[PDB]
Symmetry: C2
């Protein structure tokens, strides 16, 4: 302890290759190891059919579903972001296993990016 | 600039509703409203065909491609994680626009979550 608190960068206390739970400034691995727990699986598999339907329009809805679920555990706000995002990242990649994709064009990604900013930008900001 | 610097919580500077760019410890909206730039659209459109063809097997390869691209832009290391991920999150939701999904299963997501930990778990910790 010191009492005199000032500031700190994303290093020293935690950089990478760690256990987690308030390790770095915005990086925490504990939010990740919890993904192999049934906790995530119960939420992620519930929203697979949501993202599969909305594509990107489901993001602001599904992220909200998962985020609140993680925060309900009593986790740090910033670490909750990570876990909730990681749980989110799992729902939409699993659907591709069954999603017989056709042909995607390299156009309109610019516009899709404008949408992703809406869903998570309000959590990282 | 106080001589000494002891760690503190990621608040005070830009707790919420902030424009971005090193606003919080692990939260930055600046890494999000930059996605509407040609920068992301030029990277993410190269990732769309990759993730579409792998589902989750492309994550560890695509995330790294984008991450190194963002870090070389002179961005903060922990902030890069956010932007690089947001650009990543844009590629895989774009593909659903032309990906006619059929029937996904709520079983196996538990296992998929184990893989997502490998791709980003080395950047978040």
């Amino acid at each position: 302890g010191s009492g005199n608190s000032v500031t700190s960068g994303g290093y020293g206390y935690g950089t990478s290759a760690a256990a987690g739970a308030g390790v770095a400034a915005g990086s925490y691995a504990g939010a990740v190891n919890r993904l192999s727990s049934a906790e995530a699986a119960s939420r992620v598999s519930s929203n697979i059919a949501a993202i599969a339907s909305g594509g990107a329009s489901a993001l602001p809805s599904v992220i909200s579903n998962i985020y609140s679920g993680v925060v309900a555990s009593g986790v740090s706000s910033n670490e909750a972001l990570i876990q909730a995002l990681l749980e989110l990242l799992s729902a939409l990649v699993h659907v591709l296993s069954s999603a017989s994709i056709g042909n995607v064009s390299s156009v309109g990604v610019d516009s899709t990016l404008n949408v992703v900013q809406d869903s998570v930008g309000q959590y990282v900001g």
